[PDB]
Ligand binder design. Structure first.
Ligand SMILES: [Cu+2]
Ligand SMILES: [Cu+2]
Ligand SMILES: [Fe+3]
Ligand SMILES: [Fe+3]
Ligand SMILES: [Fe+3]
Ligand SMILES: [Fe+3]
Ligand SMILES: [Xe]
Ligand SMILES: [Xe]
Ligand SMILES: [Xe]
Ligand SMILES: [Xe]
Ligand SMILES: [Xe]
Ligand SMILES: [Xe]
Ligand SMILES: [Xe]
Ligand SMILES: [Xe]
Ligand SMILES: [Xe]
Ligand SMILES: [Xe]
Ligand SMILES: [Xe]
Ligand SMILES: [Xe]
Ligand SMILES: [Xe]
Ligand SMILES: [Xe]
Ligand SMILES: [Xe]
Ligand SMILES: [Xe]
Ligand SMILES: [Xe]
Ligand SMILES: [Xe]
Ligand SMILES: [Xe]
Ligand SMILES: [Xe]
Ligand SMILES: [Xe]
Ligand SMILES: [Xe]
Ligand SMILES: [Xe]
Ligand SMILES: [Xe]
Ligand SMILES: [Zn+2]
Ligand SMILES: [Zn+2]
Lengths: 318, 494, 118, 328, 493, 118
């Protein structure tokens, strides 16, 4: 061999054999000499790092600890869906959802299934981020997490289809709660407000850290325990995918936050201003759900867990 | 009653969306009005494929595990030694620096457009296309990896794509689409590129691989087939959906078809040269590929679109006629300028030339064979021709102005205009008409020749531009194939 | 015209001001397709027409067999597609050869190689 | 739409394959499974058998014009087998981790745990017997199509025995104490003695087809429905419903195993009235021993009617082969 | 009180077994006493690997997915066109007819032995080996399938294994092991074949493939590597276990070591010829292979074993000396009898002969090069040599008696005896000694030359034997490489 | 002796009765390694030693240069490793050449090619 890797990889890592992740993920994007300004943006170029107020000398400081290029992502997901699909077939063949009481089924349609709308919101926000971030290391983590949100939304929808014998009536019932029930309106308002945020790192902070960082613990940990007291323990086998996904998501989201916050005090002051604005809204969005189920204590526990996580970045919340 | 498969899939995708109460729909989806396209009813969107995420992951993981097993076996067994001839690797230098970066651009462009549409159904199709293009981008980097260890010119693809003169052709094609609004982006890329012109890009590269012993590339091509089936169906859904939504959409779409037909045709001129000249074992000629994939298949598609009031693209006759000339004009251009490219060129063997006479009975012996006769006599005399003067580039497609009039193959089809006190030049009427409709856009072009003369290419003399700006290693990546390090390494491999 | 979310008006990238006192000039020599495209030259607007020919055009075309036989200048000239008669001792700028003009020069009797305009 | 330049092959498959199926391209299953074993000209008589050569079809009294008449409907060659099993174990490993992380078994009362150690876990010893019996057949059967189906099934039985073991390990917190206790039931509880005696009796059977019939049709064809269907329902009434997710592997396995065991019975029974006569004699001897071995288990759990229904289901199954058993 | 990994694995394998009450142990396990081996305590068995079934399935499925994706790609891309030269395929003809069928015999042998031992630990290890051997047997059928479509000699492997003269060499080796009791079976195959002699088979075929552009074989080789680590470890545990169980086992095991060293050595003589002569690009000489994998590696093993009272195998000195001769002696035997083989032979090129001078500095120019000079002149004169008279075969290893005395390379090491009124012949003292200990066994051998002469190979003229009995297509499968359909097909590619 | 679960005694596969009134004979000719192994021959026990030489041994050894010169009848013989004096006109059977006997014939002065015993 005349050389061991591509020139752009050798500049970063040395002329030595490189990993599949390295060759897939660094310096592949177009960086300069764009021919035309966007017809849809007056302030920024194509591929413009200034789409966020966050500043980085090298956005490739954000690397994925999971080392997910496409092949490793789908490989990992295919393994996880094999178990989820089997649990769905098992519950469906033994009538584990349809044999629950009518009150229990209504609790699931009202408190769990409308989270598929929140997942849709997260899918859209992450698609936005993937189209707006410059570095391939950052943009691919956002499309993978985006498609994951769609898939989680689809598993939630299937819980309702299982309850209704595959007619759609339960999904209709559950959408009416999302649209018209007072308990969901703070969350619906919050999700719609995120859809209008311009700065992509503000958006990733709010969606992938603040909302998910409290919501996932609240729902798939705290309400999960509560559902067992309500006779719905068997739903836990259908929501195991969400717990495993979330534990995995901590790895890249914490890695990204450490790199950005550790870059500069000016970055930290920006992130804190955004935490101070948005973190209380995430708490207020979740409060009616928590008080309709596990209780407010379960939400304060989730809020304190996020506060402790934010200390890893030298940031804080209440 | 129990849902059928189409209504079930809708419940698992579009039903998750809702009408906003707390934010204006026009603030959440601000980009879908400014192009003039009117959407009457998003629910009339028909899903071009119905794949839930579980099934997507499962099937793609199966293809990937197989693809990577083959890639490792190729590398472990030095499969680069089994290609027909090292000349073939020049097709891959062109691919990694001019086509792979487009896959990656399509990933970002589709990600963004999978946020902009208010139809939940259209957003999911676009997002699945985005993550497929990411796949195509990364698996191509992995495919070419082993070639990069053994051959020159593959080492700085993305760096060269932003800078090198001839790579501004694919780059500005895709910059044009991504700077455009979302409907034009879809019309350009999903319908024109991925549906109409797709086979002209895919078939030559992938079947060239099959005829020339390149197991890595052909395996990548087999692997991408099921993906492209979805991408073609989205392209077909896109034009039908848009044309049916409002009669006012029809003339706007017509203009986009005329523009992107013509830009796509100019972009593909690079492939015509590859398949006729860069492949040691030939698949078919450019003229035969054009005739089957565009004249026959495209003719039937445009007959289908007549029911909407759509006519075939403007100047398609000029393109049908250029098929007899295109590959020969371009190879001769790259030959004289390859002191400044990251791939080699050479004079075709006498057997390739007799194949050319047969595939091009009305043009090759008259116009092109004598060029190779002269250039070979010159090379034999130690005067291998390189052209040391920079060329005029088209203001729109940015190819040097090397193309000839339909009626007169020896006369350049140059056009020029005055626009607000400045002069602009084009390779053809097709590019002229595109500029005239959107001058404010095309006057922004980063034309590499002009940029060198402005002093924006870190160099005034061309050796410094090539070595220091382009990162082309002079004497290694550029110049004639005969006497190159690739030829010497091949002859010693053999 | 361009559709945009704002007033989509920009300065051309290749206005004469960007060329450090010089100007772009293109020259087309029909029937000499050995050079695949018209030459793009950077030229001093003050140089004389005869200096353009002897210092730039003659060297640029030297690789073609017809070059040594050509009297460019007393050949036939177009400027921006209009008939043009050059003044040898006058500057480019004073005779109307402005930024991004194209001169076409036809040399009777020198029509390229092989009946192929090469 | 990729064009390819493929070659003209000199022939399409191996001679032994082309003799059996025609000169045309063969499946992976066909090339892997037919006429690949040694058949004749053996050099030395076994030191361990006075009566038969190496690779001798007379190790069974059953007679077949062609033992490759018995073929696998699943088309399992080695790679198809492990590929299918890998997929299955993925779900089983995840169900084990879930029960372990959530203390689904350790949170049960000590009385409910003892019922599992007593009624369910000692079945690992039966699996062990079935592993050993199928290793015997795989070594004795002459046709590759027949011996491979037996090594695959014997390895599955060991896998199943390992899962049942792990349930006990889950209950004792990975100490082995629950396995000690459950083994003591197998050895000394009167409830297990008819089964243990029957399993020990099978281990001494000489005729390999008699052995596959008894093990793979008669014992399994009553045991699996009784335990993983009928007892499985009854576990719910006992508060032990969560063990169902741990035994789903066994229900899926069983359903699949009916494919090849029914295809093998159809071909052997359909061959001749003599084969059928012989098979009926073995069912008359062994089927009531299988029923009587399961009886104390049914009585201690789901009730004798659960066993009578499993016997009736096996009976209905045997009727398809033109064979008789004395249930409904 | 949590179980460690060793103890947990034991609870998941050997704890499922029990002491029988209703049948006697000896009726359940009837094969364990007759060989004279004594087992004191099966609990002393140390598991050579700890792989539960879930793990075995998971890991083997991943290897199989990748393997079959490569096989498919090799075939779709006409990968056979990328081998060094069509002469290489002769190595595969010998492989599919001589060795793949041993994989299938091992599958059977290990299945049987995975029932016969009374220690459940040993039973599970043998069973995992049985199913691994079935894997090798099937994937080799699928690996060679593409070559069978383009080259001759590969079309009737199993059929020929049972019948063809030179294939009785591997067939008899494995029939001897399979007709033996369970402890001798393990000592022969797990210890001697799978541990001591394993790299002398595996390396030459798998490296040879790599050096000759055979991606399908190379890929099988890479795939089988983790299986072999287990099989080697089983081999090691077997001898240590049996040696430690009782001191009366040590003389029995020593005799098995002597017997199986010698039988393994004779079998390997086919591999020496394959690596020295059939591989167009050479990996190493048989001489070098034997030095490293036996003399060095084996030398070190037998120093381990000295602690148990084991000495290195009898006649090992003769085998070390024969490394200078073996491949040349066999090639010239096959050369003269290749009218009756499913593969081709040829005279090596001058460049290969030079290599051989360098690798056999004390023997090749003296004894063997002059043969090729003679045979080449005869071939050139239109008189290519074929020997039309059948050879004497050894009563034990069944190879023609072509081998020579240590320190007298021109004299055959023929031996003969009389047993109960009959005469028997051997190639060596090594084979004579194995016969003298077990005559009642070897007198039963199906010696192909004798069976032809008895009228049992369905033919009396040899054209009939070769075509109708052996299914060797005369003119296509056999004779010299030069002129063969394989050569002409190769040149045409 | 063989260990077995039973009385392990079998008839030899190659007893003389299995060869239909014929017998096996092996002949080794030292220093003629052209032939890789001793010849295995099927012979009538009644045939004369002289006819063994002329009708079997002569044509079997024909490929070797030394063949045409060899006087096998008058060469040095061994029978089963023992000095042996052939009687040309006596049958094989009547001079003690029994089933599976090996004869060794050494032809002094003819020791093969290249000092290689070939
Ligand atoms: Cu190289
Ligand atoms: Cu072929
Ligand atoms: Fe793509
Ligand atoms: Fe595509
Ligand atoms: Fe093996
Ligand atoms: Fe092995
Ligand atoms: Xe969680
Ligand atoms: Xe939305
Ligand atoms: Xe170009
Ligand atoms: Xe492509
Ligand atoms: Xe590629
Ligand atoms: Xe659209
Ligand atoms: Xe188009
Ligand atoms: Xe295109
Ligand atoms: Xe340049
Ligand atoms: Xe240039
Ligand atoms: Xe250029
Ligand atoms: Xe240059
Ligand atoms: Xe079951
Ligand atoms: Xe046992
Ligand atoms: Xe062999
Ligand atoms: Xe042999
Ligand atoms: Xe092997
Ligand atoms: Xe192989
Ligand atoms: Xe053992
Ligand atoms: Xe050994
Ligand atoms: Xe033979
Ligand atoms: Xe022979
Ligand atoms: Xe032979
Ligand atoms: Xe023959
Ligand atoms: Zn243009
Ligand atoms: Zn021997």
């Amino acid at each position: 061999p005349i050389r061991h890797t591509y020139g752009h990889i050798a500049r970063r890592f040395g002329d030595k054999p490189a990993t599949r992740y390295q060759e897939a993920s660094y310096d592949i994007e177009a960086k300069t000499n764009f021919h035309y300004r966007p017809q849809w943006d007056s302030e920024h170029t194509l591929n413009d790092p200034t789409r966020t107020a966050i500043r980085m000398e090298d956005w490739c400081a954000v690397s994925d600890p999971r080392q997910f290029y496409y092949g490793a992502y789908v490989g990992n997901r295919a393994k996880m869906q094999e178990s989820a699909e089997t649990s769905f077939g098992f519950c469906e063949k033994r009538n584990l959802l349809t044999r629950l009481s009518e009150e229990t089924q209504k609790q699931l349609l009202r408190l769990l299934v409308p989270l598929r709308h929140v997942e849709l919101g997260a899918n859209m926000n992450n698609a936005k981020i993937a189209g707006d971030a410059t570095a391939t290391t950052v943009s691919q983590m956002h499309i993978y997490t985006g498609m994951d949100r769609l898939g989680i939304g689809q598993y939630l929808s299937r819980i309702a289809l299982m309850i209704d014998g595959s007619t759609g009536a339960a999904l209709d019932e559950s959408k009416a709660y999302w649209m018209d029930d007072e308990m969901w309106q703070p969350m619906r308002k919050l999700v719609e407000d995120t859809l209008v945020v311009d700065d992509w790192f503000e958006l990733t902070l709010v969606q992938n850290i603040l909302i998910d960082g409290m919501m996932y613990p609240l729902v798939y940990d705290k309400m999960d325990q509560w559902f067992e007291s309500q006779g719905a323990e068997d739903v836990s086998m259908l929501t195991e995918f969400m717990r495993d996904w979330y534990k995995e998501s901590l790895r890249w989201t914490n890695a990204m936050m450490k790199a950005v916050a550790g870059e500069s005090e000016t970055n930290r002051e920006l992130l804190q201003k955004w935490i101070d604005h948005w973190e209380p809204q995430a708490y207020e969005a979740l409060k009616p759900l928590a008080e309709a189920s596990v209780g407010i204590d379960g939400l304060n526990e989730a809020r304190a867990e996020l506060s402790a996580r934010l200390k890893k970045f030298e940031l804080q919340s209440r | 009653k129990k849902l059928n498969l189409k209504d079930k899939y809708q419940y698992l995708t579009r039903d998750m969306a809702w009408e906003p109460t707390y934010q204006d729909k026009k603030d959440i989806f601000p980009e879908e009005d400014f192009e003039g396209i009117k959407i009457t009813d998003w629910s009339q969107w028909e899903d071009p494929f119905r794949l839930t995420m579980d099934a997507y992951w499962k099937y793609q993981a199966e293809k990937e595990k197989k693809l990577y097993a083959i890639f490792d076996a190729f590398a472990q067994n030095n499969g680069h030694q089994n290609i027909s001839d090292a000349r073939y690797v020049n097709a891959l230098k062109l691919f990694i620096s001019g086509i792979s970066p487009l896959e990656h651009a399509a990933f970002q462009g589709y990600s963004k457009v999978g946020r902009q549409f208010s139809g939940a159904g259209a957003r999911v199709a676009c997002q699945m296309q985005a993550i497929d293009e990411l796949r195509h981008s990364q698996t191509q980097q992995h495919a070419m990896s082993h070639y990069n260890k053994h051959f020159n010119g593959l080492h700085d693809g993305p760096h060269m794509h932003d800078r090198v003169w001839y790579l501004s052709v694919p780059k500005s094609f895709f910059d044009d689409a991504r700077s455009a609004g979302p409907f034009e982006f879809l019309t350009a890329i999903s319908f024109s590129f991925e549906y109409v012109l797709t086979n002209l890009l895919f078939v030559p590269f992938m079947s060239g691989a099959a005829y020339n012993g390149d197991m890595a590339t052909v395996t990548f091509g087999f692997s991408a087939q099921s993906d492209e089936a979805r991408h073609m169906t989205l392209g077909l859904e896109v034009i039908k959906f848009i044309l049916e939504q409002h009669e006012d959409n029809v003339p706007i779409v017509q203009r986009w078809i005329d523009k992107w037909f013509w830009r796509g045709f100019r972009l593909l001129s690079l492939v015509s040269m590859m398949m006729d000249y860069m492949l040691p074992n030939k698949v078919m000629s450019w003229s035969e590929a054009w005739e089957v994939y565009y004249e026959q298949n495209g003719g039937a598609l445009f007959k289908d679109l007549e029911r909407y009031g759509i006519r075939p693209p403007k100047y398609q006759d000029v393109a049908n006629d250029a098929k007899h000339h295109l590959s020969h004009q371009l190879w001769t251009t790259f030959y004289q300028y390859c002191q400044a490219t990251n791939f080699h060129t050479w004079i075709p063997e006498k057997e390739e030339m007799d194949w050319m006479s047969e595939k091009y009975p009305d043009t090759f012996d008259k116009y092109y064979r004598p060029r190779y006769e002269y250039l070979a006599k010159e090379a034999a005399a130690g005067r291998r021709f390189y052209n040391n003067t920079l060329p005029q580039l088209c203001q729109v497609c940015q190819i040097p102005t090397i193309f000839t009039e339909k009626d007169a193959p020896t006369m350049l089809s140059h056009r020029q205009i005055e626009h607000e006190g400045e002069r602009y030049h084009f390779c053809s009427d097709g590019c002229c008409d595109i500029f005239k409709h959107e001058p404010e856009k095309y006057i922004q072009a980063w034309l590499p020749v002009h940029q060198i003369y402005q002093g924006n290419c870190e160099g005034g003399d061309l050796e410094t531009v090539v070595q220091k700006y382009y990162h082309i290693n002079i004497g290694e990546d550029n110049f004639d194939y005969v006497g190159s390090p690739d030829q010497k390494h091949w002859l010693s491999i053999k | 015209s361009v559709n945009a979310l704002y007033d989509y008006k920009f300065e051309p990238k290749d206005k004469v001001e960007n060329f450090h006192g010089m100007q772009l000039l293109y020259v087309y020599w029909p029937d000499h397709l050995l050079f695949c495209a018209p030459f793009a030259l950077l030229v001093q607007p003050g140089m004389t027409f005869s200096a353009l020919v002897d210092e730039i055009l003659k060297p640029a075309t030297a690789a073609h067999p017809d070059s040594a036989k050509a009297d460019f200048l007393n050949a036939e000239w177009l400027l921006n597609d209009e008939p043009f008669t050059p003044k040898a001792d006058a500057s480019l700028k004073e005779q109307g050869i402005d930024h991004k003009s194209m001169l076409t020069v036809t040399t009777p009797g020198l029509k390229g190689m092989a009946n192929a305009g090469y």
